[PDB]
Amino acid sequence: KEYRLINCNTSACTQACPKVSFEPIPIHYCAPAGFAILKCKDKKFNGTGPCPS
Amino acid sequence: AENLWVTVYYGVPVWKDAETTLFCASDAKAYETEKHNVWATHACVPTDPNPQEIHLENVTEEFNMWKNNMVEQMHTDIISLWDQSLKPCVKLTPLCVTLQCTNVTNNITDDMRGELKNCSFNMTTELRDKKQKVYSLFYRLDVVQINSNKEYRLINCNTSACTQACPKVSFEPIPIHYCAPAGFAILKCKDKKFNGTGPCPSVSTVQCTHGIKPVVSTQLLLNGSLAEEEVMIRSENITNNAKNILVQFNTPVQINCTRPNNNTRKSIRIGPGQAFYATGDIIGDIRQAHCNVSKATWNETLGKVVKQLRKHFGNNTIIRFANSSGGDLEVTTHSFNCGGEFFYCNTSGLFNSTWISNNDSITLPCRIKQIINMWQRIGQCMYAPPIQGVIRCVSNITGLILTRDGGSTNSTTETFRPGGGDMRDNWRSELYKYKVVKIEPLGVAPTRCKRRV
Amino acid sequence: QVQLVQSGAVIKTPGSSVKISCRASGYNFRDYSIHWVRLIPDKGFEWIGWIKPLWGAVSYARQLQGRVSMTRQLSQDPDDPDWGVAYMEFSGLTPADTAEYFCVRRGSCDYCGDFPWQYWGQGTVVVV
Amino acid sequence: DIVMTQSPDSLAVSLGERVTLNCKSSQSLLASSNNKNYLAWYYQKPGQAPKLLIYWASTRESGVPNRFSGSGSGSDFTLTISGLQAEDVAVYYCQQYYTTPLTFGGGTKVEIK
Amino acid sequence: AVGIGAVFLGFLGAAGSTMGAASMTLTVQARNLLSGTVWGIKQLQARVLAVERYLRDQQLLGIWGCSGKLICCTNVPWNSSWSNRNLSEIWDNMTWLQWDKEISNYTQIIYGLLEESQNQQEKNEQDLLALD
Amino acid sequence: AVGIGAVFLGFLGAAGSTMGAASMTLTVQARNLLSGTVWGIKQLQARVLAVERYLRDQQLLGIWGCSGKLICCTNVPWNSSWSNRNLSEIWDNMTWLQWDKEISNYTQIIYGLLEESQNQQEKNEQDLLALD
Amino acid sequence: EIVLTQSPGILSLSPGETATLFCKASQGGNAMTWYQKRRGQVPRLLIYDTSRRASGVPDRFVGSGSGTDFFLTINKLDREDFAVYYCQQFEFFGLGSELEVH
Numbered sequence A: 001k002e003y004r005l006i007n008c009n010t011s012a013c014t015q016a017c018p019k020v021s022f023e024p025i026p027i028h029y030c031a032p033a034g035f036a037i038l039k040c041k042d043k044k045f046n047g048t049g050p051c052p053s
Numbered sequence B: 001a002e003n004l005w006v007t008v009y010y011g012v013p014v015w016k017d018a019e020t021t022l023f024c025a026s027d028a029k030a031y032e033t034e035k036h037n038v039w040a041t042h043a044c045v046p047t048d049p050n051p052q053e054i055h056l057e058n059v060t061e062e063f064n065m066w067k068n069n070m071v072e073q074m075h076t077d078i079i080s081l082w083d084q085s086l087k088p089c090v091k092l093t094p095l096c097v098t099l100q101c102t103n104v105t106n107n108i109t110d111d112m113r114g115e116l117k118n119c120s121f122n123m124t125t126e127l128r129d130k131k132q133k134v135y136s137l138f139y140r141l142d143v144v145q146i147n148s149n150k151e152y153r154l155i156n157c158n159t160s161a162c163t164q165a166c167p168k169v170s171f172e173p174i175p176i177h178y179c180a181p182a183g184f185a186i187l188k189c190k191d192k193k194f195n196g197t198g199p200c201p202s203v204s205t206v207q208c209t210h211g212i213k214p215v216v217s218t219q220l221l222l223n224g225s226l227a228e229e230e231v232m233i234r235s236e237n238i239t240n241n242a243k244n245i246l247v248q249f250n251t252p253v254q255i256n257c258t259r260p261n262n263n264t265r266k267s268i269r270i271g272p273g274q275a276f277y278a279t280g281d282i283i284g285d286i287r288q289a290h291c292n293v294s295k296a297t298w299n300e301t302l303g304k305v306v307k308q309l310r311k312h313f314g315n316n317t318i319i320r321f322a323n324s325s326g327g328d329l330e331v332t333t334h335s336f337n338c339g340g341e342f343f344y345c346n347t348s349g350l351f352n353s354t355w356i357s358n359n360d361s362i363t364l365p366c367r368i369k370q371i372i373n374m375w376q377r378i379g380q381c382m383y384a385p386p387i388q389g390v391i392r393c394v395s396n397i398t399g400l401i402l403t404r405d406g407g408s409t410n411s412t413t414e415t416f417r418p419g420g421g422d423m424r425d426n427w428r429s430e431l432y433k434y435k436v437v438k439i440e441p442l443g444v445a446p447t448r449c450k451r452r453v
Numbered sequence C: 001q002v003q004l005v006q007s008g009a010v011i012k013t014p015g016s017s018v019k020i021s022c023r024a025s026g027y028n029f030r031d032y033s034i035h036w037v038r039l040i041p042d043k044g045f046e047w048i049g050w051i052k053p054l055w056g057a058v059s060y061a062r063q064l065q066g067r068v069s070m071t072r073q074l075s076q077d078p079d080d081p082d083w084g085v086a087y088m089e090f091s092g093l094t095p096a097d098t099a100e101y102f103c104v105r106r107g108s109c110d111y112c113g114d115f116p117w118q119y120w121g122q123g124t125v126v127v128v
Numbered sequence D: 001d002i003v004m005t006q007s008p009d010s011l012a013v014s015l016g017e018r019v020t021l022n023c024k025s026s027q028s029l030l031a032s033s034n035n036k037n038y039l040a041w042y043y044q045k046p047g048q049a050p051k052l053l054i055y056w057a058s059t060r061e062s063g064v065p066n067r068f069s070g071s072g073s074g075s076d077f078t079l080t081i082s083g084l085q086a087e088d089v090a091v092y093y094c095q096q097y098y099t100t101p102l103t104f105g106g107g108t109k110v111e112i113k
Numbered sequence E, F: 001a002v003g004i005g006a007v008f009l010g011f012l013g014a015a016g017s018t019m020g021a022a023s024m025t026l027t028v029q030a031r032n033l034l035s036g037t038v039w040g041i042k043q044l045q046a047r048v049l050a051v052e053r054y055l056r057d058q059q060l061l062g063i064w065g066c067s068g069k070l071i072c073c074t075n076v077p078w079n080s081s082w083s084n085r086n087l088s089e090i091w092d093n094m095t096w097l098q099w100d101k102e103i104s105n106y107t108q109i110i111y112g113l114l115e116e117s118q119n120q121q122e123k124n125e126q127d128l129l130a131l132d
Numbered sequence G: 001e002i003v004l005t006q007s008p009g010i011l012s013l014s015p016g017e018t019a020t021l022f023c024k025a026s027q028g029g030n031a032m033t034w035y036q037k038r039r040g041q042v043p044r045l046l047i048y049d050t051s052r053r054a055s056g057v058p059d060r061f062v063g064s065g066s067g068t069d070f071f072l073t074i075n076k077l078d079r080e081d082f083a084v085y086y087c088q089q090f091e092f093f094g095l096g097s098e099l100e101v102h
């Protein structure tokens, strides 16, 4: 009864380094100069059509 | 008329202190060499030696080499640039192998020890089927015995695959000029008696720094910048004992250093386009690598530095010099690179002095390592290939890096140990003059004129 | 967090050579110097010596030279480099050396000097 | 929008000694262009129209003596009193005037214990 | 206040001279302010920092009265609460390195007044053209 | 048309106000238009796109009459085939977001006339200096 | 060597009062460090650089003075704030200023 890994015929499998963690930390996506970012503060806004606020 | 009107002026000469990234530059003769036979020859811009400076009258800026920037930048850049000349090189993955080591063919003395081991091992050939048997010569400091039979291994077989230093690229120092970008300026202190702290009365602006040959030496910093007329000792705070004292003296001390062993570089084929340069025969006598300083001029410079050390410690102070208290190899014994060869030379003959408040030459022995752990990284060692022939080099002892011991319980004396420690004490002895400032135009001032509509 | 954790207390004979370790964890151990300082009853704090653990550069108190010896053991792996072990072999034990010993570290602020010791080990009580 | 949250709900102390109060903002009110910051610290008596105490997040109003200090920049702000009087023991307020809608703090009712 | 002299008169040469004498050499510091496998990124971000700083300073000038004058006068008066010192003891006594510290606190109070006076002068000019 | 008020008056604050009222705050959008191992390339090309756009707009201004005025008048008359609406119903009724759509088709017809009038005024000025 | 001398030594004060602790340096021109050691506990950095407070210490510990005269002023003495206080200059120490409860 001899086995193998399932990925022995597609790739050498890179170990995730135990030093680095996979926890989520919040990203802020900032715009460069000349561009702006608009946020919709409307309550009943389904993500399509005119936002009044 | 007593009402003044404000006016903004552009191009106003006034600066603040700032932290920016200076860029490297080399001389035109340093730019002349090519193909990365040294580090990064075309990465840096060419410039003149002794770049242009103008003097600033009636100006006074306070300097501080200890809270200075751009020694951090030079330290980071020289570490990263040391790393970037190793990616094309050869990893010694197939050489971490069982070494069957016997003694070198020599008249063995049972009291002393042979510093060379003749080690045979299986080496993989350029074909992946056949392996060969090949021998080499290693030092005691590079191999350790794993537990009749006598089989060894390398000391770095459990931490890293050891990148061979490429024999094409050389490790000689070539002077870097650190040039400022637009909007920034660099100020140099031309004052004589300036200890690197406080107001400098005579500064001059300059576009690039003067030439800084990158030397790697823990104790006894070599080929440095000489002082003007007397020995100058420099420290952040004298009474703190955990601060190093950087001693820069006037006339340099000539030191000669040599390996008199005539070696044979022998090539071993690891794989396709993979060559390991090992030691072959020792042609002739098995002699010990060493260095010489002059006895008389070293006693002279020690008298000068005691004369200058008695200014901060009172006149009736007995100044004595003893060797390093302990540590690793390259923090206790003074390290350098004599043309692609890393020496570790014993300084116990130098710092053996006592000083009361009333044709010879010192030989000092050296060890040689072939694998090194520069800057004490976690997984990056470096094999260094052997080089042909007797190797001698001449250098100038420019200064010292001293450290006072923790004097308490009525210290009638104060003693001084040599010590390398951080490399930045080596780098702060060259950028002690300069600082970098941000030039800010658009001053604003009152004068007696309203704009005519 | 930054932790300096020592070995337990010990009872030694007059003339021995005691060894006290100090595992540091939670920071880059190659950066900060480790000081050793003692406390004697009815004598107060006495400084023993520091070590720079990047190369093990030691410096000792003047009246304790020839008796103390400091070494270190770094972390050699690319996965857990945030620990280290300092050592202190204090030899030539007399009954005047009955004291509580401490491995300490400076703070990590930009005006913290070498000697402004923020972090402190729990101390090892040594009775000779 | 911008939430202005005062950290205590009340503060009942004796008279004569100093106190201190805080107002945290959900958004950094420090205007990067003017390099000056936007808090109005108000003071409302029982049954009275309020008055300003601190403008530009640090500066006292005329008619207000030297015993007040608006302090702090960025996002968290501190009104420090130096000496309490009997005329002072009523509700304080913090206000951002950086954007629309103009939102106030919760109102820390300081009285005498 | 310029005379005949053959010395180079270079960048930051009159930084220690009095500010009535460093004003006669302001085109030098204006001139020497712009032109000057991985390291190209460092050099390139240094160059774009240089041109960004030059554009920010030229934009601060341009929203005021002077866009390319390099010496310009305006219509806000010198509030004597700012520096409370005589006119004779600035242009013949102090330097720009020393005058920078004495109004660094009152800086950014002045710049808003400069923009305010320039916007008011622009709308007055627009109305004066409009009534014609 | 400016008054006393303590609110911040920030970038794109008067985008929905009428264009006779957003014209009193134009230095704010002019100010907040320039300053703001692989990712340095993305940040760096974003910064050079910003300074390139600023230079293109300043070049379009500079080849016209105004180089740093931020409100400038010129000598081409408003062709009433472009917008065919009253003066009272633009500065008190509509916004720039709504006026942008109504002359976006007639844009680039106007800019050539602006360059033409500025080149003709430059050569008339050169000839008027030349006859003296 | 820097001989440090602490002047009050044993001082007994009621809780809610203020304490002033004096440290005297034989050589001036340097900073002073203030530690607190409670009974059977690990010492804690209170004050470094003669005025700066450490991380996690309340505001009522006020360091002051210069030259040879160094003051530690505690205001509104808590019950926990009755311990031994030490002044450090570079590697030297005082003999302890015990603060006892009246």
Ligand SMILES: *[C@@H]1O[C@H](CO)[C@@H](O[C@@H]2O[C@H](CO)[C@@H](O[C@@H]3O[C@H](CO[C@H]4O[C@H](CO)[C@@H](O)[C@H](O)[C@@H]4O)[C@@H](O)[C@H](O[C@H]4O[C@H](CO)[C@@H](O)[C@H](O)[C@@H]4O)[C@@H]3O)[C@H](O)[C@H]2NC(C)=O)[C@H](O)[C@H]1NC(C)=O
Binding pocket: B037, B170, B172, B173, B215, B222, B223, B336, B337, B338, B339, B393, B394, B395, B396
């Ligand atoms: C402190 O400063 C001194 C002064 O510069 C340094 O001394 C020099 O050190 C370098 C490198 O260590 C020496 O360079 C090497 O010299 C060897 C001796 O040959 C010399 O003499 C012949 C005949 O006159 C010349 O043709 C030759 O150029 C040398 O001047 C050479 O064998 C070496 O050349 C080999 O390696 C290079 C590497 O690229 C190849 O290009 C060559 O073709 C050849 O294979 C090399 O040139 C230099 O000679 C030293 N000068 C003096 C006056 O002694 C110290 O090293 C420095 N201290 C420290 C610690 O750096």
Ligand SMILES: *[C@@H]1O[C@H](CO)[C@@H](O[C@@H]2O[C@H](CO)[C@@H](O[C@@H]3O[C@H](CO)[C@@H](O)[C@H](O[C@H]4O[C@H](CO)[C@@H](O)[C@H](O)[C@@H]4O)[C@@H]3O)[C@H](O)[C@H]2NC(C)=O)[C@H](O)[C@H]1NC(C)=O
Binding pocket: B346, B347, B348, B349
């Ligand atoms: C740097 O260099 C110094 C000197 O250049 C070097 O110090 C020497 O180290 C050795 C051992 O490392 C010391 O010990 C000697 O070792 C031999 C070995 O058999 C002993 O026999 C010697 O004893 C003789 O001398 C005694 C006293 O005179 C006699 O009582 C005895 O009967 C023997 O005759 C001796 O102990 C040696 O003493 C020192 N040298 C000096 C001057 O102290 C140092 O080790 C080098 N640094 C490093 C890191 O290696």
Ligand SMILES: *[C@@H]1O[C@H](CO)[C@@H](O[C@@H]2O[C@H](CO)[C@@H](O[C@@H]3O[C@H](CO)[C@@H](O)[C@H](O[C@H]4O[C@H](CO)[C@@H](O)[C@H](O)[C@@H]4O)[C@@H]3O)[C@H](O)[C@H]2NC(C)=O)[C@H](O)[C@H]1NC(C)=O
Binding pocket: B064, B067, B197, B236, B237, C113, G029, G030, G031, G032, G049, G051, G052
């Ligand atoms: C060993 O010597 C060095 C070299 O002098 C010395 O470094 C200096 O430390 C001081 C702090 O001890 C640094 O700070 C300055 O201190 C002076 C005098 O107090 C003032 O100009 C400034 O401090 C003011 O502001 C502080 C906070 O705002 C206040 O707490 C203080 O009371 C003052 O009002 C300034 O910050 C100084 O910059 C360094 N100088 C250098 C060149 O490094 C070091 O402290 C000495 N070691 C010891 C243990 O004293």
Ligand SMILES: *[C@@H]1O[C@H](CO)[C@@H](O[C@@H]2O[C@H](CO)[C@@H](O[C@@H]3O[C@H](CO)[C@@H](O)[C@H](O)[C@@H]3O)[C@H](O)[C@H]2NC(C)=O)[C@H](O)[C@H]1NC(C)=O
Binding pocket: B323, B324, B325, B326, B332, B333, B346, B348
């Ligand atoms: C500074 O100088 C002193 C004085 O020479 C050095 O002390 C000496 O150190 C050596 C080790 O390098 C000692 O040698 C001994 O050799 C025996 C041989 O078997 C070995 O078993 C011992 O463990 C020890 O290695 C020597 O006794 C010692 N001498 C004295 C008087 O202490 C010191 O090493 C020098 N420091 C440096 C950094 O060079």
Ligand SMILES: *[C@@H]1O[C@H](CO)[C@@H](O[C@@H]2O[C@H](CO)[C@@H](O)[C@H](O)[C@H]2NC(C)=O)[C@H](O)[C@H]1NC(C)=O
Binding pocket: A046, A048, A049, A050
């Ligand atoms: C999301 O809401 C929008 C309105 O804002 C809806 O869009 C309109 O839907 C009606 C039919 O219900 C159409 O007659 C309109 O033409 C739509 N307007 C637009 C602008 O699309 C939309 O149907 C909603 N979507 C969902 C998934 O609920």
Ligand SMILES: *[C@@H]1O[C@H](CO)[C@@H](O[C@@H]2O[C@H](CO)[C@@H](O)[C@H](O)[C@H]2NC(C)=O)[C@H](O)[C@H]1NC(C)=O
Binding pocket: B103, B104, B105, B118, B119, B120, B135, B280, B281, B282
């Ligand atoms: C190192 O050891 C090797 C053996 O592994 C020595 O090489 C042999 O030397 C003897 C003596 O002349 C010859 O007869 C053999 O033919 C050699 N064998 C090979 C494979 O070369 C070598 O001489 C030793 N070198 C040193 C410096 O000790």
Ligand SMILES: *[C@@H]1O[C@H](CO)[C@@H](O[C@@H]2O[C@H](CO)[C@@H](O)[C@H](O)[C@H]2NC(C)=O)[C@H](O)[C@H]1NC(C)=O
Binding pocket: B102, B103, B108, B109, B110, B111, B112, B113, B114
């Ligand atoms: C070969 O090297 C070994 C070491 O691996 C030598 O063995 C010891 O060497 C030391 C110093 O060289 C002597 O003090 C010991 O007495 C040696 N051990 C024995 C059991 O004699 C060995 O002497 C070297 N030479 C030979 C010919 O084997």
Ligand SMILES: *[C@@H]1O[C@H](CO)[C@@H](O[C@@H]2O[C@H](CO)[C@@H](O)[C@H](O)[C@H]2NC(C)=O)[C@H](O)[C@H]1NC(C)=O
Binding pocket: B100, B120, B121, B122, B133
């Ligand atoms: C090189 O490889 C050879 C063959 O793989 C090794 O020789 C073997 O050594 C073991 C242990 O002594 C013996 O049991 C085998 O019989 C040997 N095989 C042969 C073919 O000789 C040898 O040890 C390796 N190393 C060196 C230095 O020669």
Ligand SMILES: *[C@@H]1O[C@H](CO)[C@@H](O[C@@H]2O[C@H](CO)[C@@H](O)[C@H](O)[C@H]2NC(C)=O)[C@H](O)[C@H]1NC(C)=O
Binding pocket: B195, B197, B198, B199, B234, B235, B236, B237, B238
């Ligand atoms: C380096 O020189 C400076 C003077 O330029 C010394 O600094 C002064 O030292 C005196 C005491 O001797 C103090 O009273 C001054 O306040 C210091 N001034 C400044 C600006 O720090 C300094 O002590 C010297 N340092 C060394 C190591 O010799």
Ligand SMILES: *[C@@H]1O[C@H](CO)[C@@H](O[C@@H]2O[C@H](CO)[C@@H](O)[C@H](O)[C@H]2NC(C)=O)[C@H](O)[C@H]1NC(C)=O
Binding pocket: B262, B263, B283, B389, B390
């Ligand atoms: C080191 O050894 C080599 C031998 O490999 C010496 O080179 C020989 O030198 C002699 C005369 O000096 C010539 O006749 C030979 O042709 C040389 N042989 C080779 C292979 O180069 C060299 O001289 C020795 N170096 C020293 C300093 O003694």
Ligand SMILES: *[C@@H]1O[C@H](CO)[C@@H](O[C@@H]2O[C@H](CO)[C@@H](O)[C@H](O)[C@H]2NC(C)=O)[C@H](O)[C@H]1NC(C)=O
Binding pocket: B254, B255, B256, B292, B293, B294, B361, B394
């Ligand atoms: C270090 O080496 C230099 C050679 O590079 C020695 O200088 C020579 O000294 C001899 C006398 O001993 C003179 O005849 C030579 O003319 C000198 N040559 C040069 C180039 O200077 C120096 O003496 C050596 N010093 C020591 C301490 O060994």
Ligand SMILES: *[C@@H]1O[C@H](CO)[C@@H](O[C@@H]2O[C@H](CO)[C@@H](O)[C@H](O)[C@H]2NC(C)=O)[C@H](O)[C@H]1NC(C)=O
Binding pocket: B251, B252, B254, B394, B395, B396
């Ligand atoms: C060590 O310093 C000496 C000066 O003390 C250097 O000698 C000078 O070298 C330059 C060119 O390198 C010559 O122009 C001078 O004439 C030399 N002066 C003297 C007095 O010799 C020497 O080059 C330095 N380096 C070494 C390796 O000795």
Ligand SMILES: *[C@@H]1O[C@H](CO)[C@@H](O)[C@H](O)[C@H]1NC(C)=O
Binding pocket: A006, A009, A010
């Ligand atoms: C790899 O092996 C598995 C198991 O036999 C098989 O399901 C899969 O298709 C194979 N993949 C390839 C690319 O051969």
Ligand SMILES: *[C@@H]1O[C@H](CO)[C@@H](O)[C@H](O)[C@H]1NC(C)=O
Binding pocket: B144, B155, B158, B159, C076
């Ligand atoms: C590697 O082996 C040497 C020799 O046994 C030992 O001293 C060292 O601690 C080892 N390193 C590691 C990371 O195991």
Ligand SMILES: *[C@@H]1O[C@H](CO)[C@@H](O)[C@H](O)[C@H]1NC(C)=O
Binding pocket: B314, B315
């Ligand atoms: C030591 O003596 C010298 C005489 O050369 C004098 O200049 C200096 O001031 C003296 N220093 C002290 C501390 O007495």
Ligand SMILES: *[C@@H]1O[C@H](CO)[C@@H](O)[C@H](O)[C@H]1NC(C)=O
Binding pocket: B348, B349, B352
């Ligand atoms: C110290 O000096 C003496 C005499 O000069 C010498 O005999 C001794 O070997 C020296 N010490 C060392 C460790 O070399």
